[PDB]
């Protein structure tokens, strides 16, 4: 409670309260309040600001539900003490609820709590596995006359030839080969190790950290599962902390899905399962443990896969990863292997923890929308029948056409994905977790970027198309 | 009191007494006195210097009413201790009052206290919201042969492509998109956070701080309302502190209204309302809460809007912001939304705090003249009837002409504004708060600049006009 | 004739036909035709292209009246022979006349020939005196982050200190002091001398050339008077030739009115008078020779001075010259001296050549519109009475106000000028020489620039307004 927060305020001295607070149709935002100003009223009626990022015609002020005054903590990082204390959207206003043209954290719950009003179960766990890139210099720009971008970080093969002064020292990981190889070679740990400490400090639980697979600083930190609304918001920290230590160390950290080509572009796998009492109705018999229930879920996703990836796969870049691999998970099936397969029902053991890993989502989504939409579907499957059918176990590769061609795809390609969502509306819209707007506005946004991207001619195009 | 100041002097040791003291037809000034020299006499008869900035023919020495020996405090910043202790203009001389060709702080009060002698009420509150820019390097010059200016600060999009050495690190806010996004991206807080601490240290009350919306370091710090004379003079500190920490941090801070084009040029919104006993006669029923009274005010402004913006909208730059937007508040109406609308009657709640936000004024005015003139009018409306009519609620945009054309404008453009004031004299002149001179001198000044500006040919003109 | 042109074609071999042809609401344009393609049909039905520069909604092709197939000549400059052969606008189309949203050369004549249908006289002579600047390097640009421009040319004082290698050699003209001083000091002649040769080669008649008064390459070449339509179009060459030799020599030539500040920005004085048979009804008795007739003219201008300078004084820069001088001709009176006075009735001798010099117009106008509008007015004065009153002979300077203040001004300042024209319509509109459109479109254009100019903040503004 506040009574509490209240102490904490003195527990630590603190002044100011901020970093991470609102968070856009896109991601993260803050405002800073002098230490005083906090006080119940504050806790009970909020504070309010207005529009900007989704909003039309004048003055729609929005209450800032100083909230989840639980989701409150001392941010390491800022200078002088201060309780980073999220806010539950802007609630609305006098009605007091869905922030204008969103309230991502809201939608979260509508979803969440809505779930609860079905009975399909009682609690939904989400355990996302977001990877990120840690490089040294990131320069880029674009303009009438040209366009470009360059990435560098001691590591990333490329750099060997590179001259230094303390000079080369040459231990580094070559293209898809950043594979937990011990140090000299490992840009470093201390950055990860460190990120954990703070991650936990901030309040998440770390499960292991390590180097992913990419020539130039692909790093992954894992974090114990939660409840959509919580976990989603944990991603929000998970991120803030990375960005920051990373930067505090000397690097830039980036959750882009495909910074470079011919390497590995981080992706956010999401593991999930709902439970009733202390029973995860995702379990049972029938295929890899699991159960009827689950299957409708496996159903749900697969059904609106496209609309979802419009939600959990934005900015164009998203899809430069979601390029047909074999490695790359673009198939809409489930397996326990035979990847390529976008739904993995990991082995299990204790039914106690039987789940679903839908990997395709990329570190770029508001865990809020994404999770929501994941769930939202999952259960409309769980809901009206809907049935997986069989798992893959027969990797992609089949007389390419040979209906392997026929085979359902992960909606590779924004515009496309954007579309789906325009049509799928429904299963989202259901419960209230998702207004037409919300949906609209959302689309409407991603739309612009999609444009800026295609109107701007690409370096490669010259490569191939120039001298014609 | 002095008796007091007197202690404080020993309370702290201190030597010297200065920083911020007089303040021009334009803004801020000081002189330093060895610690001794202070002593009653001093408190009672002042100290005096002379002319320079407004003054004609020899020797008009002016008493320096060592005053508001309340408005006294230890300046952090200067080296060795010293009580920055304003001065109430130069009083005059033997008459002892309106400093030659001004006494901005005086005018303030004439106004203020004059207000009091009407009965329209007892106390006028002003709560300005001044925004400012925080950049790294500011180079410019002009001369027969050429002219120019360049601005830079890690942030401001432009800089991505830019090479560094610790190198890029690329998190920064792109054009109208400095929107409280959390750190990596936020040049930084510590500068704001910090500014608050000192702001309060200096004696103001902070209400929240944050990043405004502009590619390259638009920062805003908010401060609790006051009494014209006090608040006005608080702006005087609000400024000194910004300028200084900002500089002490490594940046230049600038209250110019439109440093760059296609971004956001800070503006000083001013919220106001007068009260009688502990009753703000600005309240009631009839439109958005409010009351008859208020309306005449809404009247007053609107009436002499032009003359006012001549006062609260100088240096040419002022108007490069006051360019017809839709966003930009150049309409002379009131709304509670439908911005574009230069008078916003914010929602309210407790009639306890019902007000008027007239946004158009820019961080560039002597809060003194500005506030004064704001008020001065406000009540001549409040005074002889004068009536708003209806609010907007129908944003600008109407068959441009379609009398939307007809519609009253915020006097966009200095010369113009200058003019108004030449004619409006009156409502200012009334009470004594404003001599012909004052007015004259004032005009007369802004005049020159306006000239230097138009005689000097502009980079763009070459753009477009050169090859003809 | 064509029959002719026809020879000329063989007289010289030539292939191609082009340089200078159409010419915008602004100034000059061409298209190149293979030598063949010319042939009567061509001469009789033209060639046609379409829109771009003034044009709305699709496809309005415009005939190109291969015309004034008189106004035809071998362009020195282009590579391979070619008959630069103007075109009489695009005529229209099937109607065949006023080019879409103009036909500047057309308007010219409507005017001209319209004149003829009044009887006020038979022929109007125009003898403009356009000055231009000849510099070495011209760099400038503007953009979110900054703006600027730099000018240089051995000459322009500034350069003395400048180091060279063949090194300094120091003879050059210091600020308002480029005054026919003999060579070492005179950037050079050969550029002028040369320009003459070609000017005549192109077909104009040179009367004398020399250095005007400005530190850095102000050059003037004079050319014998003509008929609006002819002379106007002569300016069109006068220009092309300058631009070109100038460039061919090693310099950039610029007809901007005020490239630099505190120097002299070229201006196009225009001398005029109409005649009946071989009698210039501008003569007589009554003031400085002259005659009733003239006076109504002197009237006409003075009457719509503002609207005219909107026509013969564009791009903003225009007015940085038309800044109140005493030297500077912004007064609306006539004198034979007492300059400051925008209308000079030069001494005379032979009534044979008695005229009117209205100096204010600047090298920047389509001689077409300008001349037209000059005339167009001139005679609406000549027309319905309208009367000068007395000449100045009492330079500006009179208790500034002392109604010297009262005194009619040269409409200094675009927006303003723009306006006038919006209202003055009439006297233009009269005859058909000027459609509402034409007028509209015109305005509408200058409008944009005027904007780009004021929205973009100015180097100086930082000078003065920054540290506030
Ligand atoms: Mn991984
Ligand atoms: Mn995984
Ligand atoms: Mn603001
Ligand atoms: Mn405001
Ligand atoms: Mn001359
Ligand atoms: Mn002349």
Swiss-Prot record, chains A, B, C:
Binds 2 Mn(2+) ions per subunit. Residues 104-468 form the GS catalytic domain. One of its GO terms (molecular function) is ATP binding. ATP binds at residues 207, 271-273, 339, 344, 352. Mn(2+) 1 binds at residues 129, 269, 357. It catalyses: L-glutamate + NH4(+) + ATP = L-glutamine + ADP + phosphate + H(+). SUPFAM superfamilies: Glutamine synthetase, N-terminal domain, Glutamine synthetase/guanido kinase. The modification O-AMP-tyrosine is found at residue 397. Mn(2+) 2 binds at residues 131, 212, 220. Gene3D superfamilies: Glutamine synthetase, N-terminal domain, Glutamine synthetase/guanido kinase, catalytic domain. Its EC number is 6.3.1.2. One of its GO terms (cellular component) is cytoplasm. L-glutamate binds at residues 264-265, 321, 327, 339, 359. Its cofactor is Mn(2+). When cellular nitrogen levels are high, the C-terminal adenylyl transferase (AT) of GlnE inhibits GlnA by covalent transfer of an adenylyl group from ATP to Tyr-397. Conversely, when nitrogen levels are low, the N-terminal adenylyl removase (AR) of GlnE activates GlnA by removing the adenylyl group by phosphorolysis. The fully adenylated enzyme complex is inactive. Its main location: cytoplasm. Keywords: ATP-binding, Cytoplasm, Ligase, Magnesium, Manganese, Metal-binding, Nucleotide-binding, Phosphoprotein. Catalyzes the ATP-dependent biosynthesis of glutamine from glutamate and ammonia. Oligomer of 12 subunits arranged in the form of two hexameric ring. PANTHER family: GLUTAMINE SYNTHETASE. Belongs to the glutamine synthetase family. This is Glutamine synthetase. The gene is glnA.
